[PDB]
Design a protein around this ligand. Structure first.
Ligand SMILES: Nc1ncnc2c1ncn2[C@@H]1O[C@H](COP(=O)(O)CP(=O)(O)OP(=O)(O)O)[C@@H](O)[C@H]1O
Ligand SMILES: [Cl-]
Ligand SMILES: [Mg+2]
Ligand SMILES: [Mg+2]
Length: 158
């Protein structure tokens, strides 16, 4: 099954963290990375003190169950998702979200797939479009269609 995973980092200098996360994703059991989008920059839409976010999308082939994949992405967030500076470990700055899991619809306490808000987010749609321009959602909606309708601005590369 092809799973599409969104990567977000809130770090001032996120490349190291994002690379560590990518390596960890590739090490997930019964899985391998198919492709990785470019890294995209998105400024904060509010308090401008916050660093730009780094966004990307990953296609992962997996034989794991969706909730098993979630266990792994959540583990990676716990293991690579925080950075120490000086005398303190920072809070979670890495976000790994399952956007799509094959052509499956999931609605459990732990998992909503397709991701509940991705259709509102250029920062999740554009990297996904780069790696899966012909993508069709489980309900028959098309990624191209959503981008065409909402006219979200393209993202600058990191
Ligand atoms: N598709 C999905 N991918 C990842 N986590 C998901 C998910 N659907 C539901 N969740 C749930 O989301 C819960 C909270 O995850 P968080 O990462 O803290 C939310 P976030 O990603 O910061 O915001 P967002 O969901 O608005 O993008 C998890 O405990 C997990 O069970
Ligand atoms: Cl529902
Ligand atoms: Mg998120
Ligand atoms: Mg999340």
């Amino acid at each position: 099954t092809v799973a599409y995973i969104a990567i977000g980092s809130a770090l001032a200098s996120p490349l190291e963290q994002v690379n560590a996360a990518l390596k960890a994703l590739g090490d997930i059991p019964e899985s391998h990375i198919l492709t990785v989008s470019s890294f995209y920059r998105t400024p904060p839409l509010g308090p401008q003190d916050q660093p730009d976010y780094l966004n990307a999308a990953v296609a992962l082939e997996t034989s794991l169950a969706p909730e098993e994949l979630l266990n792994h992405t959540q583990r990676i967030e716990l293991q690579q998702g925080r950075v120490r500076k000086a005398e303190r470990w920072g809070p979670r700055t890495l976000d790994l979200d399952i956007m799509l899991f094959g052509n499956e619809v999931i609605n459990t306490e732990r998992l909503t797939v397709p991701h509940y808000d991705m259709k509102n987010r250029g920062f999740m749609l554009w990297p996904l479009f780069e790696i899966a321009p012909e993508l069709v959602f489980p309900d028959g909606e098309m990624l191209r269609q959503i981008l065409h309708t909402r006219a979200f601005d393209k993202l600058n590369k990191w």
